[PDB]
Amino acid sequence: QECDFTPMLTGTPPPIYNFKRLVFTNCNYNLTKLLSLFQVSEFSCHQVSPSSLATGCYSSLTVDYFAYSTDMSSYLQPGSAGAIVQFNYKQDFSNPTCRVLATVPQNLTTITKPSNYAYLTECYKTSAYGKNYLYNAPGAYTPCLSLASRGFSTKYQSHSDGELTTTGYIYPVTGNLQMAFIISVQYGTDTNSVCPMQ
Numbered sequence: 001q002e003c004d005f006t007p008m009l010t011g012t013p014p015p016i017y018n019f020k021r022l023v024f025t026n027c028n029y030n031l032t033k034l035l036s037l038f039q040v041s042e043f044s045c046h047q048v049s050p051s052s053l054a055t056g057c058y059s060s061l062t063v064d065y066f067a068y069s070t071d072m073s074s075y076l077q078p079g080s081a082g083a084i085v086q087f088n089y090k091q092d093f094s095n096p097t098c099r100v101l102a103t104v105p106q107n108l109t110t111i112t113k114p115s116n117y118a119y120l121t122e123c124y125k126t127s128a129y130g131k132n133y134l135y136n137a138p139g140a141y142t143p144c145l146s147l148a149s150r151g152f153s154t155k156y157q158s159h160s161d162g163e164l165t166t167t168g169y170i171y172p173v174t175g176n177l178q179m180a181f182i183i184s185v186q187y188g189t190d191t192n193s194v195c196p197m198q
């Protein structure tokens with residue numbers, strides 16, 4: 001039975017700090033078919049050749065995705081500094097991963113656009129003298145996710161519950177929507193729970 005990538009093709013992809021995670025087990029995949037639907041600008045594979053990626057057998061296959069402007073590609077690079085790795089998404093390199101940046105063609109209709117691209121500029125607890133920043137663990141959500149989900153309708157809008165404080169930055173989506181996918185694979189327990197279609 002085939003792995004169904006319909007969910008990422010349907011609806012509006014979330015802001016980066018609230019990325020969507022799809023996990024596939026006990027199914028076969030056709031990654032070429034999924035990727036061919038997008039205009040790929042960048043991609044980067046760690047501990048994989050995309051060939052090995054498109055033809056290997058794993059115990060599970062995880063896909064994280066979110067709306068993301070391609071020109072912010074460097075902030076997603078391994079070892080990068082700044083708000084994106086700090087407060088939004090820090091890639092987990094403990095497993096073979098591939099990061100793909102792509103533009104959604106208008107010919108692809110089921111994907112809808114948000115009004116704004118968005119990311120967190122900070123996530124902290126107030127100390128006594130300054131801010132005690134809280135940084136993303138690899139592959140995990142910001143601890144400011146609950147606050148961030150309150151939404152941002154202006155630039156540098158803040159949210160707090162007393163303890164935590166977050167601040168988001170927003171800007172209009174101009175042109176075709178651009179996205180990021182992080183494909184991750186695991187070699188556990190289950191040898192060939194996930195294999196390439198044939």
Ligand SMILES: *[C@@H]1O[C@H](CO)[C@@H](O)[C@H](O)[C@H]1NC(C)=O
Nearest residue numbers: 030031032033034036197198
């Ligand atoms: C995977 O999808 C591609 C379309 O991009 C198609 O050409 C190919 O035949 C498919 N592979 C299998 C095994 O179905």
Ligand SMILES: *[C@@H]1O[C@H](CO)[C@@H](O)[C@H](O)[C@H]1NC(C)=O
Nearest residue numbers: 036037038039105106107108
């Ligand atoms: C959208 O239409 C075709 C069919 O999917 C696609 O291959 C093509 O790249 C797109 N058209 C453009 C980009 O003008």
